[PDB]
Protein backbone atom coordinates (compact mmCIF):
# COMPACT_ATOMS: atom_id res chain seq x y z
CA UNK A 1 0.00 0.00 0.00
CA UNK A 2 1.54 3.06 0.98
CA UNK A 3 4.80 4.42 0.55
CA UNK A 4 7.38 6.75 2.86
CA UNK A 5 5.26 9.85 3.78
CA UNK A 6 7.48 12.78 2.50
CA UNK A 7 8.90 15.19 5.24
CA UNK A 8 11.90 17.39 5.18
CA UNK A 9 15.20 16.69 7.15
CA UNK A 10 13.88 19.95 9.05
CA UNK A 11 10.47 18.84 9.98
CA UNK A 12 11.45 15.20 11.55
CA UNK A 13 15.37 17.09 12.74
CA UNK A 14 12.71 19.77 15.22
CA UNK A 15 10.32 16.77 16.13
CA UNK A 16 13.10 14.63 17.21
CA UNK A 17 14.07 18.14 18.99
CA UNK A 18 10.39 17.31 20.93
CA UNK A 19 11.65 14.39 20.96
CA UNK A 20 14.60 14.59 23.15
CA UNK A 21 12.59 17.61 24.91
CA UNK A 22 10.27 15.59 26.62
CA UNK A 23 12.82 13.21 28.30
CA UNK A 24 13.28 16.13 30.53
CA UNK A 25 10.05 18.17 30.72
CA UNK A 26 7.03 17.48 30.17
CA UNK A 27 6.00 20.56 27.83
CA UNK A 28 9.02 21.81 26.03
CA UNK A 29 9.69 25.04 24.48
CA UNK A 30 10.65 26.50 21.16
CA UNK A 31 13.85 27.82 22.52
CA UNK A 32 15.02 24.54 23.66
CA UNK A 33 13.37 22.96 20.26
CA UNK A 34 15.66 25.23 18.30
CA UNK A 35 18.75 24.75 20.69
CA UNK A 36 18.95 21.25 20.09
CA UNK A 37 17.51 21.77 16.63
CA UNK A 38 20.44 23.15 14.74
CA UNK A 39 12.12 26.75 12.87
CA UNK A 40 9.06 28.20 14.11
CA UNK A 41 7.52 28.02 10.78
CA UNK A 42 8.03 23.98 10.95
CA UNK A 43 6.27 24.36 14.69
CA UNK A 44 3.15 25.88 12.53
CA UNK A 45 3.48 22.98 10.22
CA UNK A 46 4.02 20.12 12.77
CA UNK A 47 1.08 21.67 14.76
CA UNK A 48 -1.01 22.10 11.76
CA UNK A 49 -0.43 17.99 10.58
CA UNK A 50 -1.00 17.53 14.19
CA UNK A 51 2.24 16.01 15.12
CA UNK A 52 2.50 18.30 17.85
CA UNK A 53 0.24 19.71 20.17
CA UNK A 54 0.50 22.89 22.36
CA UNK A 55 -0.06 23.48 25.82
CA UNK A 56 0.46 26.46 28.07
CA UNK A 57 -0.63 25.37 31.83
CA UNK A 58 -0.95 27.72 35.13
CA UNK A 59 3.28 27.36 35.20
CA UNK A 60 4.75 26.14 31.75
CA UNK A 61 4.64 27.29 27.78
CA UNK A 62 5.47 24.80 25.16
CA UNK A 63 4.61 22.05 23.11
CA UNK A 64 4.26 17.92 23.36
CA UNK A 65 4.92 15.17 20.82
CA UNK A 66 1.27 13.95 19.82
CA UNK A 67 0.87 9.87 18.89
CA UNK A 68 1.17 10.83 14.90
CA UNK A 69 4.32 11.97 15.62
CA UNK A 70 5.85 9.34 17.45
CA UNK A 71 3.91 7.44 15.06
CA UNK A 72 6.45 9.09 12.25
CA UNK A 73 9.47 9.27 14.56
CA UNK A 74 8.92 4.94 14.64
CA UNK A 75 8.38 4.88 10.92
CA UNK A 76 11.25 6.92 9.43
CA UNK A 77 14.00 4.80 11.77
CA UNK A 78 12.58 1.36 10.66
CA UNK A 79 12.93 2.68 7.00
CA UNK A 80 16.43 3.74 7.81
CA UNK A 81 16.82 0.10 8.72
CA UNK A 82 15.22 -1.08 5.56
CA UNK A 83 12.83 -3.39 7.86
CA UNK A 84 9.82 -1.56 6.33
CA UNK A 85 9.00 0.58 3.58
CA UNK A 86 5.04 0.48 2.98
CA UNK A 87 1.90 0.11 5.00
CA UNK A 88 -1.45 -1.46 4.52
CA UNK A 89 -4.30 -1.17 6.56
CA UNK A 90 -4.86 -1.12 10.53
CA UNK A 91 -5.89 -5.00 10.57
CA UNK A 92 -7.47 -4.42 14.17
CA UNK A 93 -7.01 -3.24 17.84
CA UNK A 94 -5.62 -5.31 20.75
CA UNK A 95 -5.49 -4.72 24.37
CA UNK A 96 -4.02 -1.61 24.35
CA UNK A 97 -2.08 -1.12 20.74
CA UNK A 98 -2.80 -1.31 16.94
CA UNK A 99 -1.99 -3.90 14.46
CA UNK A 100 -0.96 -2.68 10.66
CA UNK A 101 0.11 -4.84 7.63
CA UNK A 102 3.75 -3.93 6.74
CA UNK A 103 6.30 -4.51 3.64
CA UNK A 104 9.72 -3.41 3.03
CA UNK A 105 10.56 -2.83 -0.55
CA UNK A 106 11.86 -6.27 -0.85
CA UNK A 107 8.08 -7.13 -1.09
CA UNK A 108 8.00 -9.40 2.29
CA UNK A 109 5.15 -8.65 4.14
CA UNK A 110 5.32 -8.34 8.11
CA UNK A 111 3.11 -6.95 10.87
CA UNK A 112 3.73 -3.60 12.92
CA UNK A 113 2.24 -3.11 16.27
CA UNK A 114 1.95 0.18 17.96
CA UNK A 115 1.67 0.18 21.60
CA UNK A 116 -0.52 2.46 22.47
CA UNK A 117 -1.38 2.69 26.64
CA UNK A 118 -4.11 5.36 27.54
CA UNK A 119 -6.94 2.68 27.34
CA UNK A 120 -8.15 5.87 30.19
CA UNK A 121 -0.83 6.88 29.74
CA UNK A 122 2.98 8.21 28.22
CA UNK A 123 4.67 7.50 25.35
CA UNK A 124 7.02 6.16 27.37
CA UNK A 125 5.57 3.68 28.94
CA UNK A 126 4.45 2.46 25.42
CA UNK A 127 8.54 2.19 24.27
CA UNK A 128 9.26 0.17 27.78
CA UNK A 129 6.14 -2.09 26.93
CA UNK A 130 7.56 -3.20 23.28
CA UNK A 131 11.10 -3.53 24.78
CA UNK A 132 9.39 -5.63 27.50
CA UNK A 133 7.82 -7.82 24.49
CA UNK A 134 10.55 -7.80 21.91
CA UNK A 135 12.78 -9.52 24.69
CA UNK A 136 10.22 -11.89 25.76
CA UNK A 137 9.40 -12.63 22.17
CA UNK A 138 13.08 -13.60 21.53
CA UNK A 139 13.17 -15.84 24.29
CA UNK A 140 10.09 -18.02 23.76
CA UNK A 141 11.10 -18.00 20.20
CA UNK A 142 14.44 -19.83 20.39
CA UNK A 143 12.87 -21.83 23.03
CA UNK A 144 10.46 -23.39 20.70
CA UNK A 145 7.50 -21.61 21.49
CA UNK A 146 4.83 -21.07 18.99
CA UNK A 147 5.29 -17.31 19.03
CA UNK A 148 6.08 -15.15 15.70
CA UNK A 149 9.90 -14.30 14.96
CA UNK A 150 10.49 -10.89 16.44
CA UNK A 151 12.25 -8.92 13.87
CA UNK A 152 12.92 -5.58 14.94
CA UNK A 153 11.66 -2.39 17.35
CA UNK A 154 12.09 1.04 18.08
CA UNK A 155 9.97 3.06 20.11
CA UNK A 156 6.65 2.08 20.75
CA UNK A 157 6.72 -0.16 17.56
CA UNK A 158 7.45 -3.87 17.19
CA UNK A 159 7.76 -5.72 13.71
CA UNK A 160 7.20 -9.33 14.25
CA UNK A 161 6.35 -12.05 11.35
CA UNK A 162 3.36 -12.10 10.04
CA UNK A 163 0.75 -15.12 10.67
CA UNK A 164 -1.25 -16.66 7.98
CA UNK A 165 -4.30 -16.79 10.62
CA UNK A 166 -7.47 -14.88 11.80
CA UNK A 167 -7.47 -13.40 15.84
CA UNK A 168 -9.37 -15.64 18.08
CA UNK A 169 -11.73 -12.62 18.92
CA UNK A 170 -13.26 -13.03 15.15
CA UNK A 171 -13.34 -16.90 15.25
CA UNK A 172 -17.56 -17.25 15.76
CA UNK A 173 -17.00 -21.34 14.85
CA UNK A 174 -14.72 -23.80 15.04
CA UNK A 175 -15.46 -27.70 13.80
CA UNK A 176 -12.78 -29.00 16.60
CA UNK A 177 -13.46 -26.95 20.24
CA UNK A 178 -11.71 -29.71 22.34
CA UNK A 179 -8.64 -29.09 19.70
CA UNK A 180 -7.76 -25.70 20.15
CA UNK A 181 -9.35 -25.82 23.77
CA UNK A 182 -6.25 -28.05 24.40
CA UNK A 183 -3.35 -26.69 22.80
CA UNK A 184 -4.61 -23.33 24.53
CA UNK A 185 -4.55 -24.87 28.01
CA UNK A 186 -1.14 -26.96 26.48
CA UNK A 187 0.37 -23.65 25.76
CA UNK A 188 -0.36 -22.55 29.48
CA UNK A 189 1.39 -25.00 31.10
CA UNK A 190 4.29 -24.97 29.06
CA UNK A 191 4.48 -21.69 30.08
CA UNK A 192 4.83 -22.07 33.91
CA UNK A 193 6.99 -24.92 33.10
CA UNK A 194 9.23 -22.41 31.76
CA UNK A 195 8.40 -19.93 35.10
CA UNK A 196 5.96 -17.95 33.31
CA UNK A 197 2.12 -17.09 33.97
CA UNK A 198 0.61 -14.23 31.59
CA UNK A 199 -1.74 -12.02 34.00
CA UNK A 200 -3.96 -11.32 31.26
CA UNK A 201 -4.59 -14.57 29.02
CA UNK A 202 -7.77 -13.74 27.02
CA UNK A 203 -8.78 -14.50 23.47
CA UNK A 204 -6.45 -11.27 22.37
CA UNK A 205 -3.57 -13.39 22.92
CA UNK A 206 -4.54 -16.04 20.48
CA UNK A 207 -4.32 -16.34 16.27
CA UNK A 208 -5.63 -19.63 14.55
CA UNK A 209 -4.24 -20.24 11.01
CA UNK A 210 -6.16 -22.39 8.09
CA UNK A 211 -5.17 -25.48 9.56
CA UNK A 212 -6.52 -24.06 13.28
CA UNK A 213 -2.98 -24.41 15.08
CA UNK A 214 -2.68 -21.86 17.57
CA UNK A 215 0.11 -18.67 18.22
CA UNK A 216 0.34 -16.39 21.02
CA UNK A 217 0.90 -12.36 20.69
CA UNK A 218 0.14 -10.31 23.34
CA UNK A 219 3.18 -10.33 26.20
CA UNK A 220 3.70 -7.59 28.51
CA UNK A 221 5.09 -7.89 31.61
CA UNK A 222 4.17 -11.84 33.54
CA UNK A 223 4.55 -13.12 36.94
CA UNK A 224 6.70 -15.81 38.15
CA UNK A 225 5.63 -19.18 39.03
CA UNK A 226 7.48 -18.34 42.34
CA UNK A 227 5.62 -15.43 42.58
CA UNK A 228 3.58 -15.20 45.99
CA UNK A 229 -0.60 -15.33 44.24
CA UNK A 230 1.03 -17.50 41.04
CA UNK A 231 -1.49 -19.67 41.85
CA UNK A 232 -4.35 -17.48 41.86
CA UNK A 233 -3.23 -15.90 38.37
CA UNK A 234 -3.06 -19.31 36.76
CA UNK A 235 -6.37 -19.94 38.31
CA UNK A 236 -7.06 -16.62 36.34
CA UNK A 237 -5.43 -17.26 32.74
CA UNK A 238 -7.71 -20.59 32.95
CA UNK A 239 -10.33 -19.71 34.03
CA UNK A 240 -10.58 -17.03 31.21
CA UNK A 241 -10.10 -19.10 28.21
CA UNK A 242 -12.60 -21.87 29.99
CA UNK A 243 -15.48 -18.69 29.80
CA UNK A 244 -14.65 -17.53 26.10
CA UNK A 245 -15.15 -21.57 24.70
CA UNK A 246 -18.10 -22.32 26.57
CA UNK A 247 -19.44 -18.71 25.48
CA UNK A 248 -18.08 -19.04 21.86
CA UNK A 249 -18.00 -21.66 21.21
CA UNK A 250 -20.45 -23.52 24.03
CA UNK A 251 -17.29 -25.80 24.51
CA UNK A 252 -17.01 -27.30 27.77
CA UNK A 253 -14.06 -30.07 29.38
CA UNK A 254 -13.68 -30.99 33.15
CA UNK A 255 -9.92 -30.87 31.69
CA UNK A 256 -8.73 -27.76 33.32
CA UNK A 257 -5.32 -27.81 34.34
CA UNK A 258 -3.92 -27.02 37.91
CA UNK A 259 -0.70 -25.66 39.75
CA UNK A 260 0.50 -28.81 40.58
CA UNK A 261 0.80 -30.23 37.08
CA UNK A 262 3.51 -27.34 36.68
CA UNK A 263 6.96 -29.01 36.89
CA UNK A 264 10.21 -26.39 36.60
CA UNK A 265 11.46 -26.76 33.34
CA UNK A 266 13.38 -23.56 32.55
CA UNK A 267 14.40 -20.21 34.58
CA UNK A 268 12.30 -18.10 32.09
CA UNK A 269 11.57 -15.78 35.03
CA UNK A 270 14.60 -14.46 34.51
CA UNK A 271 13.10 -10.77 34.32
CA UNK A 272 9.80 -11.49 35.78
CA UNK A 273 7.35 -10.70 38.74
CA UNK A 274 8.89 -12.56 41.68
CA UNK A 275 12.01 -14.10 40.16
CA UNK A 276 14.07 -14.26 43.41
CA UNK A 277 15.87 -17.09 42.82
CA UNK B 1 -30.65 -18.26 -14.17
CA UNK B 2 -31.29 -21.54 -13.06
CA UNK B 3 -29.04 -25.50 -12.29
CA UNK B 4 -25.72 -24.60 -13.41
CA UNK B 5 -22.91 -27.59 -14.26
CA UNK B 6 -23.10 -31.19 -13.35
CA UNK B 7 -19.69 -32.36 -11.88
CA UNK B 8 -18.12 -35.85 -11.25
CA UNK B 9 -17.78 -36.87 -7.38
CA UNK B 10 -14.26 -36.86 -8.91
CA UNK B 11 -14.04 -33.72 -10.17
CA UNK B 12 -15.62 -32.68 -6.82
CA UNK B 13 -13.04 -34.28 -4.74
CA UNK B 14 -10.11 -33.01 -6.62
CA UNK B 15 -11.57 -29.37 -6.12
CA UNK B 16 -11.64 -29.94 -2.14
CA UNK B 17 -8.16 -31.91 -2.85
CA UNK B 18 -6.81 -27.86 -3.97
CA UNK B 19 -8.69 -26.50 -1.48
CA UNK B 20 -7.59 -29.25 1.25
CA UNK B 21 -3.83 -28.08 0.41
CA UNK B 22 -4.18 -24.23 0.13
CA UNK B 23 -4.45 -24.93 3.91
CA UNK B 24 -0.49 -25.68 3.61
CA UNK B 25 0.63 -24.75 0.37
CA UNK B 26 -0.56 -21.82 -1.51
CA UNK B 27 0.23 -23.80 -4.99
CA UNK B 28 -0.41 -26.94 -4.76
CA UNK B 29 0.94 -30.13 -6.99
CA UNK B 30 -1.01 -32.95 -8.13
CA UNK B 31 1.00 -34.97 -5.83
CA UNK B 32 -0.89 -34.32 -3.14
CA UNK B 33 -4.02 -33.42 -4.67
CA UNK B 34 -3.93 -37.03 -5.81
CA UNK B 35 -2.77 -38.43 -2.53
CA UNK B 36 -5.67 -36.37 -0.60
CA UNK B 37 -8.16 -37.92 -3.05
CA UNK B 38 -6.56 -41.24 -4.56
CA UNK B 39 -7.09 -38.02 -12.21
CA UNK B 40 -4.47 -35.85 -13.42
CA UNK B 41 -7.33 -35.63 -16.45
CA UNK B 42 -9.46 -34.23 -14.17
CA UNK B 43 -7.28 -31.41 -13.45
CA UNK B 44 -6.76 -30.29 -16.95
CA UNK B 45 -10.74 -29.81 -17.16
CA UNK B 46 -10.94 -28.03 -14.08
CA UNK B 47 -8.25 -25.64 -15.69
CA UNK B 48 -10.32 -25.41 -18.63
CA UNK B 49 -13.45 -24.40 -16.87
CA UNK B 50 -11.35 -21.91 -15.01
CA UNK B 51 -12.20 -23.82 -11.59
CA UNK B 52 -8.55 -23.81 -10.60
CA UNK B 53 -5.42 -22.29 -12.34
CA UNK B 54 -1.82 -24.12 -12.17
CA UNK B 55 1.11 -21.86 -11.78
CA UNK B 56 5.10 -22.64 -12.10
CA UNK B 57 7.59 -19.75 -10.26
CA UNK B 58 10.64 -19.97 -9.01
CA UNK B 59 11.11 -23.54 -7.51
CA UNK B 60 6.97 -23.98 -6.88
CA UNK B 61 4.50 -25.93 -9.26
CA UNK B 62 1.27 -26.64 -8.76
CA UNK B 63 -2.72 -26.07 -8.66
CA UNK B 64 -4.66 -22.95 -7.02
CA UNK B 65 -8.19 -22.38 -6.31
CA UNK B 66 -9.95 -19.67 -8.79
CA UNK B 67 -12.70 -17.94 -7.01
CA UNK B 68 -15.29 -19.72 -9.49
CA UNK B 69 -13.54 -22.88 -7.98
CA UNK B 70 -14.80 -21.65 -4.42
CA UNK B 71 -18.37 -20.90 -5.83
CA UNK B 72 -19.00 -24.05 -6.65
CA UNK B 73 -17.83 -25.81 -3.82
CA UNK B 74 -19.96 -23.66 -1.53
CA UNK B 75 -22.88 -23.90 -3.69
CA UNK B 76 -22.57 -27.78 -4.00
CA UNK B 77 -21.82 -27.88 -0.18
CA UNK B 78 -25.60 -25.65 -0.12
CA UNK B 79 -27.24 -27.54 -3.05
CA UNK B 80 -26.47 -30.89 -0.22
CA UNK B 81 -28.64 -29.21 2.28
CA UNK B 82 -31.53 -28.23 0.10
CA UNK B 83 -30.48 -24.41 0.94
CA UNK B 84 -29.73 -23.35 -2.30
CA UNK B 85 -31.46 -25.45 -5.48
CA UNK B 86 -31.27 -23.03 -8.02
CA UNK B 87 -29.32 -19.42 -8.61
CA UNK B 88 -31.07 -16.07 -10.18
CA UNK B 89 -28.98 -12.68 -11.33
CA UNK B 90 -26.29 -11.11 -9.83
CA UNK B 91 -28.43 -8.17 -8.16
CA UNK B 92 -25.11 -5.66 -7.15
CA UNK B 93 -21.91 -5.13 -7.58
CA UNK B 94 -21.84 -3.13 -4.47
CA UNK B 95 -18.98 -4.11 -2.18
CA UNK B 96 -16.02 -6.52 -2.40
CA UNK B 97 -19.03 -9.33 -2.77
CA UNK B 98 -21.58 -10.53 -5.53
CA UNK B 99 -24.87 -11.25 -4.19
CA UNK B 100 -27.49 -13.16 -6.05
CA UNK B 101 -31.10 -14.37 -5.81
CA UNK B 102 -31.61 -17.81 -5.12
CA UNK B 103 -34.12 -20.75 -4.56
CA UNK B 104 -34.20 -24.01 -2.90
CA UNK B 105 -36.69 -27.36 -3.92
CA UNK B 106 -39.98 -25.39 -2.89
CA UNK B 107 -38.97 -22.46 -4.91
CA UNK B 108 -38.61 -20.12 -1.82
CA UNK B 109 -36.35 -17.31 -2.70
CA UNK B 110 -33.32 -16.04 -0.56
CA UNK B 111 -30.35 -14.16 -1.36
CA UNK B 112 -27.31 -15.63 -1.09
CA UNK B 113 -23.90 -13.11 -0.11
CA UNK B 114 -20.57 -14.45 -2.01
CA UNK B 115 -17.60 -12.90 -0.24
CA UNK B 116 -14.86 -10.78 -2.71
CA UNK B 117 -11.94 -9.62 -0.05
CA UNK B 118 -9.58 -8.56 -2.85
CA UNK B 119 -5.49 -16.46 1.62
CA UNK B 120 -8.15 -14.42 0.09
CA UNK B 121 -10.20 -17.47 0.11
CA UNK B 122 -9.63 -17.50 3.99
CA UNK B 123 -10.61 -14.49 5.09
CA UNK B 124 -13.32 -14.70 2.80
CA UNK B 125 -14.42 -17.57 4.09
CA UNK B 126 -13.75 -15.39 7.64
CA UNK B 127 -15.52 -12.38 6.86
CA UNK B 128 -18.78 -14.79 6.13
CA UNK B 129 -18.52 -16.35 9.43
CA UNK B 130 -18.35 -12.59 10.97
CA UNK B 131 -21.55 -11.68 8.89
CA UNK B 132 -23.32 -14.62 9.79
CA UNK B 133 -22.90 -14.44 13.30
CA UNK B 134 -23.22 -10.67 13.55
CA UNK B 135 -26.08 -10.67 11.84
CA UNK B 136 -27.65 -13.47 13.65
CA UNK B 137 -27.10 -11.83 16.95
CA UNK B 138 -28.99 -8.64 15.37
CA UNK B 139 -31.93 -10.88 13.88
CA UNK B 140 -32.06 -11.79 17.37
CA UNK B 141 -31.94 -8.38 19.10
CA UNK B 142 -35.00 -7.81 17.03
CA UNK B 143 -32.62 -5.23 14.56
CA UNK B 144 -33.88 -4.79 10.81
CA UNK B 145 -31.25 -6.96 9.32
CA UNK B 146 -32.21 -10.37 6.87
CA UNK B 147 -32.68 -13.41 9.20
CA UNK B 148 -29.62 -15.39 8.67
CA UNK B 149 -30.12 -18.80 6.93
CA UNK B 150 -26.71 -20.65 6.30
CA UNK B 151 -23.22 -20.06 5.47
CA UNK B 152 -20.21 -21.89 4.33
CA UNK B 153 -16.85 -20.24 2.90
CA UNK B 154 -17.08 -17.47 1.74
CA UNK B 155 -21.00 -18.01 1.28
CA UNK B 156 -23.62 -16.40 3.32
CA UNK B 157 -27.49 -17.48 2.74
CA UNK B 158 -30.09 -14.72 4.45
CA UNK B 159 -33.72 -13.83 3.81
CA UNK B 160 -34.53 -11.92 0.62
CA UNK B 161 -35.98 -8.48 1.14
CA UNK B 162 -38.97 -7.20 -0.49
CA UNK B 163 -37.82 -4.03 -1.42
CA UNK B 164 -35.39 -1.68 -3.31
CA UNK B 165 -31.83 -0.40 -2.63
CA UNK B 166 -31.32 3.23 -1.42
CA UNK B 167 -29.27 3.80 -4.42
CA UNK B 168 -31.99 3.03 -6.98
CA UNK B 169 -34.40 5.24 -5.56
CA UNK B 170 -34.77 8.79 -6.79
CA UNK B 171 -38.13 9.77 -5.19
CA UNK B 172 -39.55 9.13 -1.40
CA UNK B 173 -43.32 10.34 0.31
CA UNK B 174 -41.83 11.43 3.47
CA UNK B 175 -38.04 12.03 2.75
CA UNK B 176 -37.42 13.08 6.63
CA UNK B 177 -39.53 9.74 7.76
CA UNK B 178 -36.94 8.01 5.85
CA UNK B 179 -33.62 9.96 7.11
CA UNK B 180 -35.10 9.27 10.97
CA UNK B 181 -35.75 6.30 10.79
CA UNK B 182 -31.96 5.64 9.52
CA UNK B 183 -30.95 8.24 11.89
CA UNK B 184 -32.18 6.25 14.17
CA UNK B 185 -30.88 2.95 13.09
CA UNK B 186 -27.54 4.53 13.32
CA UNK B 187 -28.09 5.72 17.13
CA UNK B 188 -29.94 1.78 17.97
CA UNK B 189 -26.79 0.50 16.57
CA UNK B 190 -24.51 2.61 18.95
CA UNK B 191 -26.91 2.32 22.16
CA UNK B 192 -26.01 -1.34 21.75
CA UNK B 193 -22.60 -0.31 21.22
CA UNK B 194 -22.32 -0.98 17.61
CA UNK B 195 -21.37 1.36 14.65
CA UNK B 196 -22.12 -0.15 11.23
CA UNK B 197 -18.74 1.69 9.73
CA UNK B 198 -20.61 1.04 6.04
CA UNK B 199 -23.66 2.66 6.46
CA UNK B 200 -24.31 4.40 3.25
CA UNK B 201 -27.54 4.13 -0.12
CA UNK B 202 -25.89 0.39 -0.78
CA UNK B 203 -26.00 -0.56 2.71
CA UNK B 204 -29.44 0.62 3.35
CA UNK B 205 -32.66 -1.04 1.68
CA UNK B 206 -36.23 0.50 1.26
CA UNK B 207 -38.90 -1.99 1.66
CA UNK B 208 -42.99 -1.74 0.03
CA UNK B 209 -43.72 0.82 2.86
CA UNK B 210 -40.00 2.96 2.69
CA UNK B 211 -39.00 1.21 6.31
CA UNK B 212 -35.66 0.25 5.99
CA UNK B 213 -33.55 -2.89 5.99
CA UNK B 214 -29.44 -3.25 6.80
CA UNK B 215 -27.51 -5.80 4.47
CA UNK B 216 -23.60 -5.24 5.11
CA UNK B 217 -22.09 -6.62 8.40
CA UNK B 218 -18.67 -5.89 7.84
CA UNK B 219 -16.26 -3.46 9.96
CA UNK B 220 -19.22 -2.99 12.18
CA UNK B 221 -16.77 -1.72 14.76
CA UNK B 222 -17.66 -0.99 18.81
CA UNK B 223 -18.23 2.42 20.21
CA UNK B 224 -15.56 1.38 22.54
CA UNK B 225 -13.01 1.84 19.20
CA UNK B 226 -10.38 4.01 19.13
CA UNK B 227 -12.27 5.61 15.99
CA UNK B 228 -16.47 5.03 17.10
CA UNK B 229 -16.93 8.21 16.56
CA UNK B 230 -15.27 9.38 13.26
CA UNK B 231 -16.83 5.99 12.06
CA UNK B 232 -20.43 7.00 13.24
CA UNK B 233 -19.88 10.71 12.21
CA UNK B 234 -19.16 9.37 8.82
CA UNK B 235 -22.02 6.88 8.82
CA UNK B 236 -24.03 9.88 9.56
CA UNK B 237 -22.51 11.69 6.72
CA UNK B 238 -23.52 9.63 4.07
CA UNK B 239 -26.92 10.06 5.01
CA UNK B 240 -27.43 13.56 5.18
CA UNK B 241 -25.15 13.65 1.68
CA UNK B 242 -27.42 11.11 0.37
CA UNK B 243 -30.39 13.09 0.92
CA UNK B 244 -28.92 16.37 0.37
CA UNK B 245 -28.22 15.12 -3.55
CA UNK B 246 -30.79 12.46 -4.25
CA UNK B 247 -33.79 13.98 -2.25
CA UNK B 248 -32.76 17.91 -1.79
CA UNK B 249 -33.68 16.74 2.10
CA UNK B 250 -31.80 18.88 5.14
CA UNK B 251 -32.75 18.17 8.20
CA UNK B 252 -30.57 19.23 11.43
CA UNK B 253 -32.21 16.30 13.61
CA UNK B 254 -28.27 14.74 13.69
CA UNK B 255 -27.54 12.22 16.08
CA UNK B 256 -24.17 12.90 18.11
CA UNK B 257 -22.30 10.46 19.36
CA UNK B 258 -22.41 12.30 22.78
CA UNK B 259 -25.71 11.12 22.68
CA UNK B 260 -25.18 7.86 23.11
CA UNK B 261 -26.86 5.47 26.35
CA UNK B 262 -25.29 2.47 26.54
CA UNK B 263 -28.17 -0.36 26.62
CA UNK B 264 -26.41 -3.47 25.92
CA UNK B 265 -22.86 -5.01 25.25
CA UNK B 266 -23.48 -6.43 22.03
CA UNK B 267 -19.89 -5.26 20.79
CA UNK B 268 -18.56 -7.59 23.42
CA UNK B 269 -20.93 -10.59 22.95
CA UNK B 270 -19.29 -10.33 19.60
CA UNK B 271 -16.15 -9.09 20.04
CA UNK B 272 -16.07 -5.90 16.96
CA UNK B 273 -13.62 -4.08 18.78
CA UNK B 274 -13.98 -3.35 22.47
CA UNK B 275 -13.12 -4.02 26.16
CA UNK B 276 -13.85 -6.14 28.89
C1 LIG C 1 -8.74 -10.35 19.08
C2 LIG C 1 -8.55 -9.36 18.09
C3 LIG C 1 -7.21 -8.80 17.98
O1 LIG C 1 -6.44 -8.70 18.98
N1 LIG C 1 -6.89 -8.47 16.71
C4 LIG C 1 -5.81 -8.95 15.95
C5 LIG C 1 -5.65 -8.56 14.62
C6 LIG C 1 -4.61 -9.06 13.87
C7 LIG C 1 -3.70 -9.97 14.41
C8 LIG C 1 -2.60 -10.53 13.59
N2 LIG C 1 -2.99 -11.07 12.44
C9 LIG C 1 -2.06 -11.62 11.64
N3 LIG C 1 -0.77 -11.67 11.86
C10 LIG C 1 -0.34 -11.13 13.05
C11 LIG C 1 1.04 -11.17 13.34
C12 LIG C 1 1.51 -10.64 14.50
C13 LIG C 1 0.64 -10.05 15.42
C14 LIG C 1 -0.70 -9.99 15.17
C15 LIG C 1 -1.23 -10.53 13.97
C16 LIG C 1 -3.90 -10.39 15.72
C17 LIG C 1 -4.93 -9.89 16.48
C1 LIG D 1 -27.88 0.69 -4.09
C2 LIG D 1 -28.01 -0.52 -4.63
C3 LIG D 1 -26.90 -1.39 -4.60
O1 LIG D 1 -25.78 -1.03 -4.29
N1 LIG D 1 -27.20 -2.67 -4.76
C4 LIG D 1 -28.18 -3.47 -4.16
C5 LIG D 1 -28.60 -4.61 -4.82
C6 LIG D 1 -29.47 -5.48 -4.21
C7 LIG D 1 -29.91 -5.28 -2.91
C8 LIG D 1 -30.87 -6.22 -2.27
N2 LIG D 1 -32.13 -6.07 -2.63
C9 LIG D 1 -33.06 -6.86 -2.07
N3 LIG D 1 -32.85 -7.79 -1.17
C10 LIG D 1 -31.55 -7.98 -0.76
C11 LIG D 1 -31.28 -8.97 0.21
C12 LIG D 1 -30.01 -9.17 0.66
C13 LIG D 1 -28.95 -8.42 0.12
C14 LIG D 1 -29.17 -7.45 -0.82
C15 LIG D 1 -30.49 -7.21 -1.30
C16 LIG D 1 -29.46 -4.14 -2.26
C17 LIG D 1 -28.57 -3.27 -2.85
Request: charged share 25%.
Amino acid sequence: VAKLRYMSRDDFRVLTAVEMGMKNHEIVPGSLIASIASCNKVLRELVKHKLIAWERTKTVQGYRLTNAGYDYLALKTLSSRQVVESVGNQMGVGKESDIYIVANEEGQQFALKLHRLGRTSWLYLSRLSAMKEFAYMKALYERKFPVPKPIDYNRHAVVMELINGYPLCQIHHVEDPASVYDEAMELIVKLANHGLIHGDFNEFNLILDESDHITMIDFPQMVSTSHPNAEWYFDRDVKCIKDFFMKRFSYESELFPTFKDIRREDTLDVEVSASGY
